[PDB]
Amino acid sequence: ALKPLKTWSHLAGNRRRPSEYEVVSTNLHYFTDNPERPWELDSNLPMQTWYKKYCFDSPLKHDDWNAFRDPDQLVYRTYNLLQDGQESYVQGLFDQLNDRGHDQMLTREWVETLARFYTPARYLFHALQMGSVYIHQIAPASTITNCATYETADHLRWLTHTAYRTRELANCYPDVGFGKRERDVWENDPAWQGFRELIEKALIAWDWGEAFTAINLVTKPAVEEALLQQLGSLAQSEGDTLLGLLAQAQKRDAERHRRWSSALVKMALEKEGNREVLQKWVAKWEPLADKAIEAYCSALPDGENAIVEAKSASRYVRQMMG
Amino acid sequence: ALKPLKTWSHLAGNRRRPSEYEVVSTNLHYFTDNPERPWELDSNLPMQTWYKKYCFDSPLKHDDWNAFRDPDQLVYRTYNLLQDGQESYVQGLFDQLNDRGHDQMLTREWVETLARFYTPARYLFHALQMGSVYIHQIAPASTITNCATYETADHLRWLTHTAYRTRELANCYPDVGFGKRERDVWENDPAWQGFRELIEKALIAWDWGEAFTAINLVTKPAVEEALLQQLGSLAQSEGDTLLGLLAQAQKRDAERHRRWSSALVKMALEKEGNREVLQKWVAKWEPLADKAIEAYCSALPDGENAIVEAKSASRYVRQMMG
Amino acid sequence: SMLKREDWYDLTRTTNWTPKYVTENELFPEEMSGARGISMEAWEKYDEPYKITYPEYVSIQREKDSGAYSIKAALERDGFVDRADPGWVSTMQLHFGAAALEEYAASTAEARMARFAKAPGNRNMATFGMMDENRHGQIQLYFPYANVKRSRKWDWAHKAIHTNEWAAIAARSFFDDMMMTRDSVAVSIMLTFAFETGFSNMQFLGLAADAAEAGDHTFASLISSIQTDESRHAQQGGPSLKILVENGKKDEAQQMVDVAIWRSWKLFSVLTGPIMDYYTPLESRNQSFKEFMLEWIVAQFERQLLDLGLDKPWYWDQFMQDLDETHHGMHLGVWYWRPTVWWDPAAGVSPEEREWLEEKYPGWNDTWGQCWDVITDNLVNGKPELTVPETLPTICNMCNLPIAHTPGNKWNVKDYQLEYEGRLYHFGSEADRWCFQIDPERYKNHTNLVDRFLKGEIQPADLAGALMYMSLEPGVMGDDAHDYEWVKAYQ
Amino acid sequence: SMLKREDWYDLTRTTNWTPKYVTENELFPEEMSGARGISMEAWEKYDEPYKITYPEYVSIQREKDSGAYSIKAALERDGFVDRADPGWVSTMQLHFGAAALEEYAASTAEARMARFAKAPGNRNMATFGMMDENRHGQIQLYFPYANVKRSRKWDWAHKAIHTNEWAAIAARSFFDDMMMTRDSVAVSIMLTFAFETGFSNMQFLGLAADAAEAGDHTFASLISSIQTDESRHAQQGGPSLKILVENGKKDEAQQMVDVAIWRSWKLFSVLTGPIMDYYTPLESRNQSFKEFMLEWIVAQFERQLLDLGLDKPWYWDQFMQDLDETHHGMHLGVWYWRPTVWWDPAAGVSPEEREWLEEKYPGWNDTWGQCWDVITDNLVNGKPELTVPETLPTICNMCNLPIAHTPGNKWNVKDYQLEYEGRLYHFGSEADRWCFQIDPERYKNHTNLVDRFLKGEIQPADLAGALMYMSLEPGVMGDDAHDYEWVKAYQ
Amino acid sequence: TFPIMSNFERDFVIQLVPVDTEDTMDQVAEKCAYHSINRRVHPQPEKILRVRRHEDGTLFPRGMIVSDAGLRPTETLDIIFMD
Amino acid sequence: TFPIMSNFERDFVIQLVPVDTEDTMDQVAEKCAYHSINRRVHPQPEKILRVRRHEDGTLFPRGMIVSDAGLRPTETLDIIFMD
Ligand SMILES: [Fe+3]
Ligand SMILES: [Fe+3]
Ligand SMILES: [Fe+3]
Ligand SMILES: [Fe+3]
Ligand SMILES: [O-]
Ligand SMILES: [O-]
Numbered sequence A, B: 001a002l003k004p005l006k007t008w009s010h011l012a013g014n015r016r017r018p019s020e021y022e023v024v025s026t027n028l029h030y031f032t033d034n035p036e037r038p039w040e041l042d043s044n045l046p047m048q049t050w051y052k053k054y055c056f057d058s059p060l061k062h063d064d065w066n067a068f069r070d071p072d073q074l075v076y077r078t079y080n081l082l083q084d085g086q087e088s089y090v091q092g093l094f095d096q097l098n099d100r101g102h103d104q105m106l107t108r109e110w111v112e113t114l115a116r117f118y119t120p121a122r123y124l125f126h127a128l129q130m131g132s133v134y135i136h137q138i139a140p141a142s143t144i145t146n147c148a149t150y151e152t153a154d155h156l157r158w159l160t161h162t163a164y165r166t167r168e169l170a171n172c173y174p175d176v177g178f179g180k181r182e183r184d185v186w187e188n189d190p191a192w193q194g195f196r197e198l199i200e201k202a203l204i205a206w207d208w209g210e211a212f213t214a215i216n217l218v219t220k221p222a223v224e225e226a227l228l229q230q231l232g233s234l235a236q237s238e239g240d241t242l243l244g245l246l247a248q249a250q251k252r253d254a255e256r257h258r259r260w261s262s263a264l265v266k267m268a269l270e271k272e273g274n275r276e277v278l279q280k281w282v283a284k285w286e287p288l289a290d291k292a293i294e295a296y297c298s299a300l301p302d303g304e305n306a307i308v309e310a311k312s313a314s315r316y317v318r319q320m321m322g
Numbered sequence C, D: 001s002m003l004k005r006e007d008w009y010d011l012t013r014t015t016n017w018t019p020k021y022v023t024e025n026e027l028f029p030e031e032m033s034g035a036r037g038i039s040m041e042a043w044e045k046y047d048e049p050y051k052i053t054y055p056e057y058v059s060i061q062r063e064k065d066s067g068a069y070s071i072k073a074a075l076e077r078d079g080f081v082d083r084a085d086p087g088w089v090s091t092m093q094l095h096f097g098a099a100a101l102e103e104y105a106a107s108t109a110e111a112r113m114a115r116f117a118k119a120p121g122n123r124n125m126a127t128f129g130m131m132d133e134n135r136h137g138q139i140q141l142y143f144p145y146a147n148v149k150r151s152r153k154w155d156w157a158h159k160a161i162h163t164n165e166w167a168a169i170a171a172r173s174f175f176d177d178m179m180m181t182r183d184s185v186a187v188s189i190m191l192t193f194a195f196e197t198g199f200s201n202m203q204f205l206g207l208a209a210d211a212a213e214a215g216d217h218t219f220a221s222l223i224s225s226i227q228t229d230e231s232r233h234a235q236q237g238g239p240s241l242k243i244l245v246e247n248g249k250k251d252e253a254q255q256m257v258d259v260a261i262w263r264s265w266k267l268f269s270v271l272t273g274p275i276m277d278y279y280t281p282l283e284s285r286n287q288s289f290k291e292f293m294l295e296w297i298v299a300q301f302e303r304q305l306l307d308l309g310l311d312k313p314w315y316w317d318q319f320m321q322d323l324d325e326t327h328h329g330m331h332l333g334v335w336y337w338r339p340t341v342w343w344d345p346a347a348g349v350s351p352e353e354r355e356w357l358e359e360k361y362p363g364w365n366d367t368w369g370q371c372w373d374v375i376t377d378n379l380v381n382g383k384p385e386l387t388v389p390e391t392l393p394t395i396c397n398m399c400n401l402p403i404a405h406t407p408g409n410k411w412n413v414k415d416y417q418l419e420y421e422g423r424l425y426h427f428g429s430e431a432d433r434w435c436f437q438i439d440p441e442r443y444k445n446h447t448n449l450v451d452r453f454l455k456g457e458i459q460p461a462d463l464a465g466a467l468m469y470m471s472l473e474p475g476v477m478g479d480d481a482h483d484y485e486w487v488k489a490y491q
Numbered sequence E, F: 001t002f003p004i005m006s007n008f009e010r011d012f013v014i015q016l017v018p019v020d021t022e023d024t025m026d027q028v029a030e031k032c033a034y035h036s037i038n039r040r041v042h043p044q045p046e047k048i049l050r051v052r053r054h055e056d057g058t059l060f061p062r063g064m065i066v067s068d069a070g071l072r073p074t075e076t077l078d079i080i081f082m083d
Helices: A020-025 A046-056 A076-099 A108-117 A121-138 A142-172 A182-188 A190-202 A208-237 A241-268 A274-297 A303-319 B020-025 B046-056 B076-099 B108-117 B121-138 B142-172 B182-188 B190-202 B208-237 B241-268 B274-297 B303-319 C054-075 C086-116 C120-142 C152-162 C166-180 C184-213 C217-245 C250-271 C273-279 C289-308 C316-322 C326-336 C351-360 C368-380 C430-438 C449-454 C463-469 D054-075 D086-116 D120-142 D152-162 D166-180 D184-213 D217-245 D250-271 D273-279 D289-308 D316-322 D326-336 D351-360 D368-380 D430-438 D449-454 D463-469 E025-033 F025-033
Strands: C418-420 C423-425 D418-420 D423-425 E002-008 E015-019 E048-053 E076-082 F002-008 F015-019 F048-053 F076-082
Touching (some): A020 D120, A046 A121, A076 A142, A076 A241, A076 B076, A121 A182, A121 A190, A121 D086, A121 D120, A142 A241, A142 D120, A190 A208, A190 A274, A208 A241, A241 A274, B020 B142, B020 C120, B046 B121, B076 B142, B076 B241, B076 C120, B108 B142, B121 B142, B121 B190, B121 B208, B121 C086, B121 C120, B142 C086, B142 C120, B190 B208, B208 B241, B208 B274, B274 B303, C054 C120, C054 C217, C054 D054, C054 D217, C086 C120, C086 C152, C086 C166, C086 C184, C086 C217, C086 C273, C120 C184, C120 C217, C152 C166, C166 C250, C217 C250, C250 C273, C250 C430, C351 C368, C449 C463, D054 D120, D054 D217, D086 D120, D086 D152, D086 D250, D120 D152, D120 D217, D152 D166, D166 D184, D166 D250, D184 D217, D184 D289, D217 D250, D217 D289, D250 D316, D250 D326, D250 D430, D273 D326, D351 D368, D449 D463, E002 E025, E015 E025, E025 E048, E025 E076, F025 F048
Parallel strands (some): F002 F076
Antiparallel strands (some): C418 C423, E002 E015, E048 E076, F002 F015, F048 F076
């Protein structure tokens, strides 16, 4: 007869009574159970083929991915406590700077900047959600997926702030087209084609390791440096305390994604080959990050310096993991 | 045999199934049960005498005080949900403007202003807690007490913000004496003796109606206009976004106290006599409110205008209730 | 980044100043603060062991309430209350009546310390003390309110302390002395130290445990949460006692504690004693009200009192003895006079119950057993009317509780009488009397229920009259909790 | 001031753009999105009936989790699980094994819609759909985890879908077809519409109610909360079906629903049927699995399908009939083959149970009753070994469940065989077969457990071998839930 | 009419008993037992009920009247068993 | 050795039964009942077990051997009661 255990079977002899996190997160996926036929069906289905090609046959290899752990140890329950608090704080900023009519105190210049440089981010931001969402469902481990799961909602979070703020800007400045114009800008404004191209092409990198690099290691720090860092300090200097703050807030989210991305990279470098494998996708993609930063930051005030600060900061992300 | 009831006996035939608020708040006090001997003891005890004199023998009379209702309908459970949210938002402002080192971006002038005009408010604020706390325990109805109960914690709330911010200011500017100097300022600075005297004397008005007027109707709008309104807009204009915001936040609290105070006054005017009774304490106290506003607002930049804006705004509170 | 709490805490409570425009005594009347000649500056040494700040409060107590309110919501419909031991249901109806509004009235008690106390740590801690009791009063209303359709007896959660029913008066007697009619420093000693630190916290644990054992989780959780708040304002007495000893005042302090504990003990011996040893089913009794008291209340007092620089009250040896007797007295009274209370008293003298009773209290059956013998005979023999009364008992003129003690073969019922300014008062212990003597001015012209009867204050002056005067009618009037179930054991 | 939601909601989902640097088809591969020739611009008409935004989500679901986690915390120690009907405990162990990881795997299902779907309302709603299933999977682990010390059977909440045990495979058969191996539009139909809107939501209600009736509130609350989330992503199918009908596609849509519902029905007829009509004590049965299905699932489907522009699936009359038979088949199989599952199957053929069974299913005893007769005789007569098996049953080659139907006097067991490219497949319904026929390429070379036995894939190739291959050992292997209690009724 | 407190032997509680200023000590003792005997204390008819001032021990002969004992209204008394 | 599926009369489920290519129809019918008779279906000894191809109705004489029926491996058969 099989004895009752202290914890889950797959977790025995850990020597640390397992955390709530290790309990609800680990070894969840099953399709990694039969690499030859991942899904309980004909082995030749298009989805079978997709998972074999893009998930199993990644040049980025480990022998136990389920050994991964999110440094923040995030679970559904504690993602919501974290985020409930952070949403109180921003919903509070919205509520109260409105109260003041903060939107009225901004200049005709600064306003024109916003419509060009801020509100179209709704597209870039949703695009990241798709890219981040896509990592979810091809990552080779339930803990990698979860990290991605939560990262994706933050992305949603940011789309929402940005959608909200637009309605309010459209409200305060009706003659500008706020909410109506962003697509066109996204699609046709030289400032935005650096980013659009980078993101359009990352969105079809199907291999999980290439997606994770393409999206998390290259694209995100570019978007984060250009749209949050640079448009952030400029907004603050230009009178916009709200966006100065709103952006600083979103960056706490971004810093958490950089943690779990760093963590996974730390994990991949335990195995020979991977540094190269990753340096190779970096070097494929980075050129587009630079192109993206360049076309966006130079349309800004103090263009040439924004381009330099951002490039070096985003590069820094990657240097700090090797 | 006595039948089971739909609600509390004291609440039957209300015709609106009673609210959680009407359920947990009403008709709570018992000492109003025997006006001749309020407390289950010798009728001659000093506390017996105190309640007869200062509670029962108020010239401010109603025949049913328990008919009072807080317009916000606040209960312990919903005071904490309200306030938990508002504390997230301010703890968030603290956390993140620090992040920036917002304290470093302030001028030597503005800093000197703070130490004189902002940080000593810890005393005025605690004093209000005592005055507000005192209303609690002499008010003639459990619903009036509760309103006071919660008002008092907000007062505590404000003392805490102010204590917190001082440590941080003492941290960022050690040469100033932050935290060490406030008592002296409170006690000796001409700007503060308008207020100190008004509050010292309100704190010994023992009659509940006089306390409620003395504290809620006269003193609070003065402190609120001078310290939150005026020092608020000046801080914002002077670079201090934090205090600009921190103050705007505390004023949501103050606006709720003005609601329940307004409400109680609306209630007292149902009875002949009371408008006069109240106008009489106003006219006794107001002169000190003016004195308090004058000595504080004139030490400020744009002194003479601050004095006018504030006087008229605080007067306005009272006009709006008759 | 946020500061460590340690970094700025002190500034919250840095709030005394020298009044100029009113005098120190106008600001801090001696009748309200009882600063007792001790300097503002020496009160500033008051330092509460357990420290909390506003955001920390509103944040913790949000989750506290979310939880309990969700338990209540979840179990609501299952309606556990209609299949609970009726010994249980009674315990609940008694508790709510005695605690709800008294808890509410505690906030004023704290509101006293928070305006009138000279030590600023006390003033802020007393503010959350205020905030604490507001919950307790409010929560303890919302909860029994689910049951108002079930029995009118539940209306008493709200109505009890509004009446002149003998317990209600006993309760007001305790609390008004303890917490409502005394100065700031006194409340901190008598209420937070003696009653909350000394009795309530442990009782509330016991009560949650017992609630659980009985299968009542809604209640199990309710009590359990209210207890989590105790420690935070219960602390407030200690630091005061500290300050008083450390000046010229160990006697004045000593005396207050002596008073506070006895009165506490007495109320306790009638609200908790009887439940522990009678209302709780036999197979749920972990330990005796006697043991419980020795383990969980007595040692802890001596512990506290040693640490503070104080000695055990004069009555301590007596108190020890009284644990064997007092509550069965109060039980017997409550049950005998069961239509005068708003719950249904469990008899708890079934055969097994009786041995258990004889186990924990040797020589019980040859004292308390005797009376119960006569009662049972009378119910076996179809003459029940001789198990309800035709008179009032004598009421202690302090504790507002019957004067009752060991009967049977070791009969020892005494009345501690005192004539004072014409009137003859009656006292139920050596201590109840002595309490009065040291404060005669404080109790002088109060009149217990028996006095009221006698002075023609209760009309008609028969039993039905006193029933009406205590606002009791059939339907809330108490009967045997089990409808005389345990009788069949004797035939 | 804040804006009304209505004011800005649209901008959240205003997110399509024309790709330039990659083509529309690179961005939205047809195998993943199944846009089906319908324009991006015509997908933009997708409008979800029930709308929520991020802050509203993280705020509601905070309180949802606070609550359930506090219920679990509160009742934890009382340990209800050790005195629960063992028919109950079984229901729990079965549910957790079947749902936990499948729920977890749903998030990937939604993650599919949230990256690959052309309608942006769908993409954002699918993101909370993702967020929803992450809770479900996580919560449904934390909860059974309290019981890992109680029985190894609880490890199966995590381990079940990792094994090749016949149910686990049945489950993966359903889900992988439904939600994991199909394009965005297909998942929205097959999973959210057919399974969640059609079956799960109602089941989860039923299950919470039943949990409650059984005195299990921790579970009562758990299921109850998970259900509150259903509606919010379950909606997602409707609007897709709307879009498909409204173009050239009612057939393709029709077909998918036809498939989705049958497969759903089958899984349902073995996980829920048997519980309703057998595991749940007699005095807790509100209604029959048949009635339940008619009231709470059937009408609702027809309702939905009328509104959408669709007609009842071809098999509907058959389906109606099958409600009388299928589950008792699956019950009989499960119990007979009880060591092959990880819970302990309740027999549920006590005399009273049997009349109830004959009440709700007239002519039960003259069909299903027969077999059970023989089983009982054998247990009365001390020959129990003839109540466990020495062979595998035939497995439907679609639903991965035994091929079983009415026996006794009205015997009607049929096998719907198909020869296809050399191989002979076996089907348990007209529909199971037909499902395959319309998608032969999709199932062609999959092999049910019986095939595996036969191809020499299970070694040793005896029973003990299959036991090991399904990761089952004594200790998790299933026996009679009541230790043959109901036998004594027959001697 | 004169109210007294009644500490009945072998009972658990002192009780309020109306008596008459003219009732004899014996008659007091009867009005008391009504409230203790066969309610809580078993009759003892080999024994005689005596009536003694609670405060100090002093003892009253059976045929002495209330009016003559100079009790204080609401004075407590023992109702003891003797022979 | 040849595997077949066994739809036994008056039973609830088709079951896997190994048989021999040489076993006679009779002998098939025996190997089947082992798994149904007295497990789930009551013996009927006024009656004779016959063996008929499930798909199409066709019927096998008792002494015909597996090898001669040209069944498909894993072919389902009815094991019916006759006289
Ligand atoms: Fe309390
Ligand atoms: Fe307390
Ligand atoms: Fe789910
Ligand atoms: Fe779902
Ligand atoms: O408390
Ligand atoms: O769900």
